[PDB]
Design a protein around this ligand. Structure first.
Ligand SMILES: *[C@@H]1O[C@H](CO)[C@@H](O[C@@H]2O[C@H](CO)[C@@H](O[C@@H]3O[C@H](CO)[C@@H](O)[C@H](O[C@H]4O[C@H](CO)[C@@H](O)[C@H](O)[C@@H]4O)[C@@H]3O)[C@H](O)[C@H]2NC(C)=O)[C@H](O)[C@H]1NC(C)=O
Ligand SMILES: *[C@@H]1O[C@H](CO)[C@@H](O[C@@H]2O[C@H](CO)[C@@H](O[C@@H]3O[C@H](CO)[C@@H](O)[C@H](O[C@H]4O[C@H](CO)[C@@H](O)[C@H](O)[C@@H]4O)[C@@H]3O)[C@H](O)[C@H]2NC(C)=O)[C@H](O)[C@H]1NC(C)=O
Ligand SMILES: *[C@@H]1O[C@H](CO)[C@@H](O[C@@H]2O[C@H](CO)[C@@H](O[C@@H]3O[C@H](CO)[C@@H](O)[C@H](O[C@H]4O[C@H](CO)[C@@H](O)[C@H](O)[C@@H]4O)[C@@H]3O)[C@H](O)[C@H]2NC(C)=O)[C@H](O)[C@H]1NC(C)=O
Ligand SMILES: CC(C)[C@H](C)[C@@H](O)[C@H](O)[C@@H](C)[C@H]1CC[C@H]2[C@@H]3COC(=O)[C@H]4C[C@H](O)[C@H](O)C[C@]4(C)[C@H]3CC[C@]12C
Ligand SMILES: *[C@@H]1O[C@H](CO)[C@@H](O)[C@H](O)[C@H]1NC(C)=O
Ligand SMILES: *[C@@H]1O[C@H](CO)[C@@H](O)[C@H](O)[C@H]1NC(C)=O
Ligand SMILES: *[C@@H]1O[C@H](CO)[C@@H](O)[C@H](O)[C@H]1NC(C)=O
Length: 741
């Protein structure tokens, strides 16, 4: 036929306008398209093309002129294909049924989509994750009332009543509307959409009316979360008898949990609102269908109603960040046959752990009991039940006394263990080396003694070791050389000894090494310079000596950090007020702990009030450098190597209280991101290099107690700092000091 001749010529003309033609290397003229990678054929005719996740790097016009006009094409999938430009009028084949253009760079007003009406058979349209917008006045209509599925999520659509604009010309055919991740406001009226099954209007700018749903005859999925809605949603969804998922989380709802349609309900989320009072007895009505419940981050209180035993289908129960109290209602949890995730974190549950809990170790994937008021010992008999499935165990920030049960090694599926912030004595059981899947061992702020288990080598998956604030002794176990995935090692405020092993250079994933306030010694390993993920080095308050190896900076400009991101931390800034408190500040892991309990450190730390929190976020993804370097309060000597200046992402530099001599390298002036510079109490001499006048981001400097001399630089930021920062430098003069003689 002709369409065959035309099919091949159209496909090859498309290939030919690609900047990287090597992308469709098996496409070629005088070959049958049905043999082409990306092509679906039925009876020797093209019915579908899928060029998704290939960087085609061409514009929509190339697509609509070559591809969308092919006779018989039924579906075109071009998600994440680097298509830019915008939709305009074109001839479209009547067979085309699905168009997926999601995750591209389509730009322009959302009114451009209206020109896709050329496609008389189009029923499914995904244009999510682009940059389509709605400039100014919202008038007219989208005019695609034949659609069954429309996805406009994650665009740049800012406007009021955009939904009415979408639905203006009719929605009798519409089954699934998603438009989340925009900035849409106003009214949502889908009452004329009597076949609508799926509505996601989440993460927008709604702060007035609740969506109006009319008879709600077909609605199964309703997501209005992530807005600023308040008011009577109970009445709005009261006609909704087929509802399976109701997500109203992250809004401004207040009062008690009101009546709900439970007979079909599988997923319910009320999280992150201002609901008050206690879980009502009437929710037992969903115990026949309910698979997921989330009431986290409200003001709920009291106990977990006993009715939950009937919710035998309930897989996840999340109630964290309320004020639930009482003992672990094991009598109810043991009936929830299907329970997999249990999250009661950040409440005020109390008492010891009931012995019956050891049964759930054979069904649960996650047990999150962090930040409560539990007391007593960790159940030794825990994970007796053969085939222990438990993956995550979070018991941090409670009142647990006793030893760490070696029995925990039987929970062989364990990926995450967090026993921090308790009162645990005894040693770190050697048997934890048996947890072949463990990624996180977090035991910080307890009273753990003895040495760090050599047997920890037997854990190949290990990524984080957080042992700060204990009573550990002995040296860094040579065995740890084996855990090559470590990206965060924190051993501060113990009584460790020995040197820093030279095998640290081995771990190419280590991003944070914190060894402060112990008794480590010897020289700084030039081997640290071999770590290619290292961004935070805190060796303060120890007994290291020798000279700062220039080699430790060899990685600067090559540093990659990706795995360390997204982890909750607190950074506690040192105010130079108390002389017993050392270092720039303490970076501490802080997943599942209340800041209100930082006061617990008072007895272990001479530091008093300045707490930064967040989630780790490197300032680059690649080609970075160290961001933090503290070696204060040691016995280092010799001169600062000029390579010190080679780290453009360095925010903090503390080398204070050592025996460093010679003169401040002029390369410090290259450290353009520097916020803090402490070189106090050393033996540095010569002149403050004028180059340092180029630093623009210094919020703090200290050069006091050296043998520096000559004039303080008048340009840059020096005039900004008080005299104290320069005291005890005999030959030093110039404002803020007395003028030079
Ligand atoms: C409009 O297009 C968007 C963008 O593609 C689309 O959203 C994305 O959908 C996909 C699935 O269709 C999501 O990817 C999933 O992510 C989950 C984790 O959250 C994974 O578990 C899933 O993996 C499963 O399936 C894979 C094969 O697809 C298997 O390899 C794997 O083993 C699992 O079985 C899956 O990868 C994606 O997260 C969303 N979100 C994005 C990218 O924004 C959206 O659904 C489209 N809209 C409509 C109406 O179709
Ligand atoms: C019930 O609803 C809640 C609340 O909406 C929901 O949890 C949320 O999931 C969404 C994903 O749909 C999360 O949103 C993302 O947050 C991450 C992390 O900060 C961001 O990186 C993401 O930004 C991207 O996507 C945006 C579009 O949504 C884009 O505009 C942006 O440019 C980025 O590409 C995104 O915002 C959100 O973090 C959570 N919220 C909370 C509080 O957990 C939950 O999953 C729902 N439950 C069920 C089962 O449906
Ligand atoms: C490096 O490690 C060591 C080991 O922790 C650390 O020494 C400890 O410092 C803390 C905090 O200063 C000390 O805690 C004190 O304990 C005594 C009793 O032994 C108490 O009397 C003290 O109480 C005072 O402060 C309280 C509030 O914090 C007040 O309520 C009270 O009225 C008192 O004023 C205080 O809690 C602890 O004794 C030492 N332990 C050791 C081993 O010496 C050291 O400070 C760390 N170094 C650095 C640089 O951080
Ligand atoms: C990359 C991570 C490991 C890291 C924790 C990161 O996520 C985090 O944002 C870091 C970069 C933060 C945590 C503490 C922050 C510092 C807080 O303490 C310092 O006093 C302030 C003072 C002042 O505000 C300066 O502008 C920056 C400055 C000095 C901050 C520099 C950036 C931080 C160091
Ligand atoms: C589309 O992307 C290409 C590649 O960068 C560019 O040359 C062209 O100008 C872009 N078109 C639009 C509309 O931005
Ligand atoms: C959300 O809507 C309000 C009211 O229309 C508007 O004033 C505001 O600009 C919008 N906020 C955002 C974050 O765009
Ligand atoms: C939370 O519950 C506890 C224990 O019953 C109660 O004493 C406390 O007042 C509650 N917290 C608040 C602030 O309501």
């Amino acid at each position: 036929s002709q369409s065959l001749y035309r099919e091949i010529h159209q496909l090859i003309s498309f290939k030919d306008v690609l900047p990287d033609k090597n992308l469709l290397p098996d496409w070629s003229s005088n070959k049958n398209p049905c043999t082409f990678d990306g092509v679906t054929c039925r009876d020797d005719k093209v019915t579908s093309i899928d060029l998704s996740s290939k960087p085609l790097n061409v514009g929509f016009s190339a697509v609509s002129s070559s591809l969308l006009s092919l006779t018989g094409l039924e579906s075109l999938f071009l998600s994440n294909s680097h298509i830019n430009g915008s939709v305009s009028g074109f001839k479209c084949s009547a067979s085309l049924t699905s168009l997926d253009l999601s995750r591209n760079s389509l730009s322009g007003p959302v009114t451009t989509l209206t020109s896709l009406g050329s496609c008389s058979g189009l029923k499914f349209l995904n244009v999510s994750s682009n940059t389509l917008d709605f400039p100014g006045k919202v008038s007219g209509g989208l005019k695609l009332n034949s659609l069954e599925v429309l996805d406009l999520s994650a665009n740049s659509i800012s406007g009021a009543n955009v939904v009415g604009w979408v639905l203006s010309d009719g929605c009798g055919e519409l089954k699934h509307l998603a438009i989340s991740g925009n900035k849409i406001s106003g009214d949502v009226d889908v009452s004329r959409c009597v076949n609508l099954e799926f509505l996601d209007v989440s993460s927008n700018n709604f702060s007035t009316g609740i969506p109006f749903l009319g008879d709600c005859s077909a609605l199964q999925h309703l997501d209005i979360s992530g807005n600023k809605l308040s008011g009577d949603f109970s009445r709005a969804i009261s006609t909704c008898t087929e509802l399976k998922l109701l997500n109203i989380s992250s809004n401004q709802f207040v009062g008690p949990i009101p009546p709900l349609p439970l007979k079909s309900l599988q997923y319910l989320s009320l999280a992150e609102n201002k609901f008050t009072g206690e879980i009502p007895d009437f929710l037992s009505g969903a115990c026949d269908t309910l698979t997921g419940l989330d009431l986290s981050g409200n003001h709920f209180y009291g106990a977990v109603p006993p009715f939950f035993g009937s919710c035998s289908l309930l897989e996840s129960l999340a109630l964290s960040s309320n004020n639930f109290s009482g003992e672990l209602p094991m009598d109810t949890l043991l009936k929830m046959r299907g329970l997999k995730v249990l999250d009661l974190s950040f409440n005020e549950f109390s008492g010891e752990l009931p012995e019956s809990l050891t049964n759930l170790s054979a069904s649960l994937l996650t047990l999150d009991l962090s930040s409560n008021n539990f007391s007593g010992p960790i159940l030794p008999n825990l994970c007796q039940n053969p085939k222990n499935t438990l993956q995550e165990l979070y018991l941090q920030n409670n009142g647990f006394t006793g030893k760490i049960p070696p029995t925990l090694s039987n929970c062989s599926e364990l990926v995450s263990l967090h026993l921090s912030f308790n009162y645990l004595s005894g040693t770190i059981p050697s048997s934890l080396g048996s947890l072949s899947k463990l990624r996180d061992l977090k035991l910080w702020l307890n009273m753990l003694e003895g040495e760090i288990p050599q047997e920890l080598m037997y854990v190949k998956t290990l990524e984080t070791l957080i042992l700060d604030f204990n009573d550990l002794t002995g040296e860094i176990p040579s065995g740890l050389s084996n855990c090559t995935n470590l990206n965060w090692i924190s051993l501060s405020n113990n009584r460790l000894t020995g040197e820093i092993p030279k095998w640290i250079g081995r771990l190419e994933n280590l991003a944070i090494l914190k060894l402060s306030n112990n008794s480590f010694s010897g020289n700084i390993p030039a081997e640290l310079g071999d770590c290619r993920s290292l961004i935070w080095l805190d060796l303060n308050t120890n007994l290291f000596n020798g000279t700062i190896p220039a080699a430790m900076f060899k990685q600067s400009g090559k540093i990659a950090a990706n795995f360390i991101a997204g982890k909750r931390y607190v950074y506690i800034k040192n105010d130079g007020m108390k002389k017993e408190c050392h270092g720039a500040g303490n970076l501490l892991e802080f997943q599942g702990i209340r800041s209100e309990q930082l006061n617990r450190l008072s007895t272990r730390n001479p530091c008093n009030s300045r707490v930064y929190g967040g989630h780790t976020s490197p300032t680059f993804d690649n080609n970075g450098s160290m961001m933090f370097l503290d070696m204060s309060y040691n016995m280092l000597s010799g001169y600062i190597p000029k390579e010190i200046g080679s780290m453009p992402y360095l925010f903090i530099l503390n080398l204070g209280h050592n025996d460093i001599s010679g003169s401040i390298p002029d390369e410090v002036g290259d450290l353009r991101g520097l916020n803090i510079l402490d070189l106090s109490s050393n033996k540095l001499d010569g002149r403050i290099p004028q180059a340092m006048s180029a630093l623009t981001m210094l919020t703090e400097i200290d050069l006091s107690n050296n043998n520096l001399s000559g004039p303080i630089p008048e340009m840059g930021q020096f005039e900004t700092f008080p005299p104290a920062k320069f005291l005890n430098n005999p030959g030093l003069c110039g404002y803020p000091l007395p003028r030079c003689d």
